């Protein structure tokens, strides 16, 4: 299962040079310094860098990079990517349901799952939880093991692998390394970039690519770097660890002849002989939604202290607000309370949606590793994530509030005059959280995202319609009031609630208002803020909130589609 | 400069056992596993754990722990503690001005500073910036060097040191280790707990304490662990790194005889012979304020993109608000605008103070390492930090707002009716930020702090006085309205601004109000919200905000004083 590469001159501005050498079966390694070219070479060789920077040829047993390459090549990321909240058996199933062909039945699929969990000994914990924050069933020793397995259901012949042991110390380290050694010669050409190994794991490599400063410096077998550096003229610290000795060479013991001293050695020509010798999606959309939805939903359930907690806090907020605004009399202090509670519901619905940006910034690493592999298409991931986490998390705090407070406060007592409030809170929640999605769909750090969203929401709240009479704003600023979501929410709620009311005890102003400074009816307070009264005057706010949703969602889908996946 | 310790039976519930052994001059080491007892032993031996858990005796050349011990013992923390924004020479001065006796003049102090920066070669960069986030002049190789120096101005004979090389790779690592080797036998008994060293630095140790699982397992010289484990019956991987070989022993190659196999060896009795043989603040308050103030102020200046940025954003907020509320007419839409802008100003002075909690949670590590050492007294640190960062950062956004918006908006045009607004904004800023200090004075993670503060501020804003008429709240909730800072700010601003106004064009209500539903004067809107009108009715809010400051500051000082400094 050879992987003869040839002249990988990658230019992002290089990061590499005319590398050579082939990686026969066994257990090939990439020693390197911390960040010279090692990880970059393992990325470029695993079809993980955009080809426009690569300017050379690679091969696969003699055929230049078939299209469905990643379909037959695993590549396990260095840091964990497995969903901790799910359990090992279900993680293996989720990896098996999306990437291997669904012409076979579920039966042989579970059969292969048991085959993998024995060829990678884990029936130890074949149903334990892995966990991230609030529960930690298994440890790293099994985390990396299930990460190695998660790409072994498809059974590729080239198991790419980067920095297996960074974060594991000696015991589990030797465990996973001997595991690699063993499951290698079932015919699997592992290619892993280790970070200062020991000598006890230096036993069996068959290959190692001492590469530093963007230039190759040795590509012989494992039992040859010792001899190569012997002929180079060093004692190598008679008792030492050579795998650290070579690094001790590169750092400060210079370079533009140390890289040069190798091409003249035997190994360059040794391999380059055979180099020049050889020189002459799968599934539907249905599954890719029906499984991403399951995974994200059961994940949401897995660590409930994140979401369920704010459900408790929204119940408490609803109850405390019902306690404060219990009466809602119809006297001069009726307008203040009524335009206060609705205001405080809308801006609340808004600023409690900035906590739904991590829908796409916690797992950018996971989404990216998944999409570079042939799991699904970005539209499927998007719709699944929405239908799983946005939809049933923003739909509850629109029913807790409006069922708890509506009868305590004693607002307009009608059926539709209640369902309209529920629906408008739902709409403003969805629209604000979708804007939150549109802003933070691409980043990886959440600081600037949360900052921008909190500033935008503050400005929208200023233009909401309570802190300033929207008719007295200057002409060249009144055009800004259309970008504000709290306006479209608060106006709809007001128009729902303020219509048939009379806020002046003893004075019937509906026939005519005496003294014309009084706001002795709901219509007068509603027009005084510049709000329509025709039935369109309400649903105009919903056709305007059903539009900010679609715009702020297609912007998010585009930001996901056009994101550099390399 | 020996440090013979004896039977350190620490109990937090142990973490250690009857350890023995002495640490003669040279370069003593603490190998250990990742977290067994190594770091804990180096902490307990450096007078860094509260003695109530220690139940044994230590010695210092024959005298049991003099009171001014840390006055003559450095202990450089593992992770960086140096202020990155300052520059190396000024960091060394700041360490020299607080901890060494101020009877000598500044002259010999700078002389010793040059002596140190040559004995620790850094005139390379003796004025470069170190930097944290936004500027990164020097690298880790000099960061750890200046951290090692920062405690060498006092010149202690016992230079405690924990994990020098964790985060430095080979080149600078060998640099600092050989530096330790060299500056050792000017007579300095370094005691450092290294984390899986190499053999190239395994040259010269004179000592090493292989301690794991809370129990000692070897305390011979450096050239003896090899022989001890020879007589123990292991080949030690003929070519390998022994410093990793011993760890390879402990992990899984068991314990309750491997610790037992040593006491019977020669070294236990070897040392325990001489064990049983030997068995029978500085400165004023003036300096400690005048220097913490300088350091914190120049630090604030060092990375200005943190503070100066929100000064830009407060200028922008002031200008945009001046643009929105330009007119402020005196008609029916005058009360809404006037009670809107003041509300927004108060609520923004509050919420924008929740960003001043990191005054004491970014450097809890630094304050703690500094106070365990004899730098200053906690009251000095407190007053300096206040006078340096709280005072001139909360005083500007009270002058940007009230000078930008007061003449655009065209509020009450008088001198004192302007300085009172400025002063009230200053008071509410100080009071809210002091509450922020009182909540987050002890923690180390800022998540729960910011969450609690945002919830408290949200509740105070509900009870502010605009979203609900404070006279219609039920009797058993009206007692809550006294805990709210936005109330005490917004009420003062209103009472300042609403007194002599007439908000009804053409109707002179000051003589008598017709139709009694009109709010045709400022007094009526001011009483309708339950606010006094006597001149005391305003300053009552300032005697109530000058009290929440003192309470929320003494609570912070107590939380700093009673914090576990170990």
């Amino acid at each position, epitope marked *: 299962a050879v992987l003869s590469f040839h002249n990988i001159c990658y230019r992002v501005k290089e990061i590499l040079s005319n590398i050579n050498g082939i990686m026969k079966p066994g257990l090939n390694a990439i020693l390197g310094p911390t960040g010279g070219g090692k990880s970059s070479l393992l990325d470029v060789l695993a079809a993980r860098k955009d080809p426009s920077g690569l300017s050379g040829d690679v091969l696969i047993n003699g055929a230049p990079r078939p299209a469905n390459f990643k379909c037959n090549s695993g590549y396990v990321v260095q840091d964990d990517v497995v969903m901790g909240t799910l359990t090992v058996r279900e993680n293996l199933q989720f990896s098996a349901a999306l990437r291997l062909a669904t012409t076979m039945t579920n039966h042989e699929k579970n059969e292969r799952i048991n085959r993998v969990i024995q060829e990678l000994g884990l029936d130890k914990v074949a149903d334990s939880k892995v966990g991230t924050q609030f529960i930690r069933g298994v440890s790293g020793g099994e985390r990396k093991r299930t990460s190695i397995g998660m790409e072994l259901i498809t059974d590729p012949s080239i198991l790419f692998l980067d920095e297996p042991t960074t974060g594991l110390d000696s015991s589990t380290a030797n465990a996973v390394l001997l595991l690699l050694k063993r499951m290698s010669k079932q015919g699997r050409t592992i290619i892993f970039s280790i970070h200062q190994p020991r000598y006890s794991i230096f036993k069996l490599f068959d290959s190692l690519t001492l590469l530093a400063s963007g230039r190759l410096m040795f590509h012989g077998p494992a039992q040859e770097a010792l001899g190569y550096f012997e002929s180079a003229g060093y004692h190598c610290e008679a008792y030492n660890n050579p795998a650290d000795f070579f690094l001790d060479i590169i750092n400060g013991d210079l370079i533009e002849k140390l890289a040069e001293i190798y091409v003249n050695s035997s190994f360059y020509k040794e391999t380059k002989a055979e180099l020049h010798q050889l020189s002459g999606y799968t599934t539907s959309f249905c599954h890719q939604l029906r499984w991403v939805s399951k995974r994200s939903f059961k994940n949401l359930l897995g660590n409930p202290q994140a979401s369920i907690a704010q459900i408790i806090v929204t119940v408490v907020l609803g109850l405390v607000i019902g306690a404060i605004y219990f009466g809602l009399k119809n006297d001069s202090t009726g307008i203040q309370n009524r335009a206060g509670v609705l205001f405080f519901l809308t801006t609340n619905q808004c600023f409690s949606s900035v906590s739904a940006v991590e829908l796409f910034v916690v797992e950018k690493k996971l989404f990216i590793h998944e999409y570079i592999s042939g799991y699904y298409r970005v539209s499927s991931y998007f719709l699944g994530k929405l239908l799983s986490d946005l939809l049933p998390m923003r739909m509850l705090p629109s029913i807790i509030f409006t069922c708890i407070v509506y009868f305590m406060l004693g607002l307009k007592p009608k059926a539709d005059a209640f369902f309209v409030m529920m629906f408008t809170l739902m709409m403003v929640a969805y629209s604000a959280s979708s804007m939150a999605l549109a802003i933070a769909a691409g980043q990886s750090v959440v600081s600037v995202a949360t900052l921008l969203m909190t500033i935008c929401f503050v400005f929208m709240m200023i233009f909401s319609g309570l802190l300033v009479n929207l008719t007295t704003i200057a002409s060249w600023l009144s055009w800004l009031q259309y970008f504000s979501i709290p306006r479209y929410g608060f106006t709809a709620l007001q128009h729902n609630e303020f219509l048939g009311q009379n806020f002046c005890p003893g004075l019937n102003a509906t*026939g*005519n*208002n*005496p*003294c*014309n*400074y009084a706001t002795c009816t709901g*219509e*007068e307070y509603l*027009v005084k803020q510049g709000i*329509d*009264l025709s039935p369109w005057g309400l649903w105009k706010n919903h056709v305007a909130l059903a539009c900010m949703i679609v715009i702020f969602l297609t912007i998010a889908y585009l930001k996901l589609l056009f994101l550099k996946k390399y | 400069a020996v440090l013979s310790f004896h039977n350190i039976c620490y109990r937090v519930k142990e973490i250690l056992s009857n350890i023995n052994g002495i640490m003669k001059p040279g370069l003593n080491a603490i190998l250990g596993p990742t977290g067994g007892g190594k770091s804990s032993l180096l902490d307990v031996l450096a007078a860094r754990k509260d003695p109530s858990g220690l139940s044994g005796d230590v010695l210092i050349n024959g005298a049991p722990r003099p009171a001014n011990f840390k006055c003559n013992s450095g202990y450089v923390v593992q992770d960086d503690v140096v202020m990155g924004t300052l520059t190396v020479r000024e960091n060394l001065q700041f360490s020299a001005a607080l901890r060494l006796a101020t009877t000598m003049t500044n002259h010999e102090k700078n002389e010793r500073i040059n002596r140190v920066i040559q004995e620790l070669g850094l005139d390379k960069v003796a004025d470069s910036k170190v930097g944290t986030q936004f500027i990164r002049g020097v690298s880790g190789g000099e960061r750890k060097r200046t951290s090692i120096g920062m405690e060498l101005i006092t010149d202690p004979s016992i230079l405690f040191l924990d994990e020098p090389t964790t985060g430095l790779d080979s080149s600078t690592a060998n640099a600092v280790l050989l530096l330790l080797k060299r500056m050792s036998k000017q007579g300095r008994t370094i005691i450092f707990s290294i984390h899986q060293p190499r053999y190239s630095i395994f040259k010269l140790f004179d000592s090493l304490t292989l301690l794991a699982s809370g129990r000692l397992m070897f305390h011979g010289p450096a050239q003896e662990a090899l022989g001890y484990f020879e007589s123990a019956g292991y080949h030690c991987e003929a070519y390998n790194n022994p410093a990793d070989f011993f760890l390879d022993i402990i992990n899984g190659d068991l314990i309750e005889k491997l610790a037992e196999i040593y006491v019977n060896s020669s070294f236990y009795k070897e040392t325990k012979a001489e064990l049983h043989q030997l068995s029978g603040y500085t400165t004023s308050f003036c300096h400690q304020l005048r220097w913490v103030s300088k350091r914190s102020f120049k630090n604030l200046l060092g990375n200005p993109q943190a503070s100066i940025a929100q000064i830009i954003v407060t200028v922008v907020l002031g200008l945009v608000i001046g643009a929105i509320y330009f007119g402020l*007419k*005196n*008609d029916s839409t005058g009360i809404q605008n006037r009670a809107g802008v003041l509300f927004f100003l108060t609520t923004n002075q509050c919420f924008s103070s929740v960003s001043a909690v990191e005054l004491f949670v970014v450097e809890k590590k630094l304050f703690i390492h500094e106070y365990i050492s004899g730098y200053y007294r906690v009251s000095s640190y407190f007053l300096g930090k206040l006078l340096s960062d709280l005072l001139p950062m909360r005083m500007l956004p009270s002058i940007i707002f009230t000078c930008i918006v007061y003449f655009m908006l065209g509020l009450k045009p008088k001198a004192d009716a302007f300085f009172v607004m400025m002063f009230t904004l200053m008071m509410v800023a100080y009071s809210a930020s002091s509450m922020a200090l009182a909540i987050a004075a002890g923690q180390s993670v800022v998540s729960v702090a910011t969450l609690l503060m945002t919830i408290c501020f949200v509740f105070m804003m509900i009870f502010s006085g605009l979203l609900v008429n404070l006279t219609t709240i039920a009797s058993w909730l009206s007692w809550l309205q006294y805990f709210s800072i936005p109330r005490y700010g917004f009420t003062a601003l209103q009472h300042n601004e609403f007194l002599g106004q*007439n908000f*009804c*064009p*053409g*109707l*002179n209500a000051t003589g008598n109000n*017709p*139709c009694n539903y*009109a709010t045709c004067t400022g007094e009526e809107y001011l009483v309708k919200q339950g606010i006094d009108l006597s001149p005391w009715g305003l300053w009552k809010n300032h005697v109530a905000l000058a009290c929440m400051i003192v309470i929320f500051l003494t609570i912070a000082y107590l939380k700093l004083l009673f914090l576990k400094k170990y």
Partner: antibody, heavy 118, light 107 residues
Framework: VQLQESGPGLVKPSQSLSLTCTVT?????????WNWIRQFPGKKLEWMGY???????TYNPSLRGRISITRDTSKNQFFLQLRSVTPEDTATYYC????????????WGQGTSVTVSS | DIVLTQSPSSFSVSLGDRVTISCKASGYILNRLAWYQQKPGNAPRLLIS???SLETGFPSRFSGTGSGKDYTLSISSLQTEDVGTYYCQQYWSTPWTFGGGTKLEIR
């Protein structure tokens, strides 16, 4: 309660204009707001601003800075000052008087016929 | 602003025909539309406030109706002293805009 309008019955363009409506029977600094309704020759009224009882004013936005109403409250007058007069506003000016707590221009002057021509 | 328009900008009635005048607004006035009655050579004297009330010194013929936008005055069997244009005038917004006003024709 009893208004009277009296000023120059001719101006030239780009000059100014003053009209000096002398209230009587009521102190203009006591209760109401006082207006300056003008009517074109095609019989179509325009508002043209008011001066409140305390001293504040508010002008018809269609008149940008071309109008300024002031009051010499010693003899309870209140004046009109229209500047840069176009020869089109050959109106009539009527010196109206707001009420505030009822809303209607209860009392009106007699109106002069300003003619803005050479 | 709010442009008050009276589409029937001229009428032609006989001495007794219960004629009405319609003054539709361009926003929402909320019964704040007042009617004046200019005579040929005088100042418009108030006729109806609040769109429903009357003014002491006037008969009980005149009477206002309508709400929201479409307000109407309704003279009942106009007598001889009833000629002369009729201007509506909202007073809800800040620039108070009158109307075109409808003369009256005696057959």
């Amino acid at each position: 309660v009893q208004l009277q309008e009296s000023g120059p019955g001719l101006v030239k363009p780009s000059q100014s204009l003053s009209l000096t409506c002398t209230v009587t029977g009521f102190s203009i600094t006591s209760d109401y707001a006082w207006n300056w309704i003008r009517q074109f020759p095609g019989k179509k009224l325009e508002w043209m601003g008011y001066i409140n009882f305390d001293g504040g004013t508010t002008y018809n936005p269609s008149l940008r800075g071309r109008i300024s109403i002031t009051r010499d409250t010693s003899k309870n007058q209140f004046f009109l000052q229209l500047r840069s007069v176009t020869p089109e506003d050959t109106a009539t000016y009527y010196c109206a008087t707001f009420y505030g707590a009822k809303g209607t221009l209860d009392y009106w002057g007699q109106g002069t016929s300003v003619t803005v021509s050479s | 602003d709010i442009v008050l328009t009276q589409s029937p900008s001229s009428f032609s009635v006989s001495l007794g025909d219960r004629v009405t005048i319609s003054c539709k607004a361009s926003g929402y006035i909320l019964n704040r539309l007042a009617w004046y009655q200019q005579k040929p050579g005088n100042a418009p004297r108030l006729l109806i406030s609040g769109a429903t009330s009357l003014e002491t010194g006037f008969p009980s013929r005149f009477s206002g109706t309508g709400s929201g936008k479409d307000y109407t005055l309704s003279i009942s069997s106009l007598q001889t002293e009833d000629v002369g244009t009729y201007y509506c005038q909202q007073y809800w917004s800040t620039p108070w805009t009158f109307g075109g006003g409808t003369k009256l024709e005696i057959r």
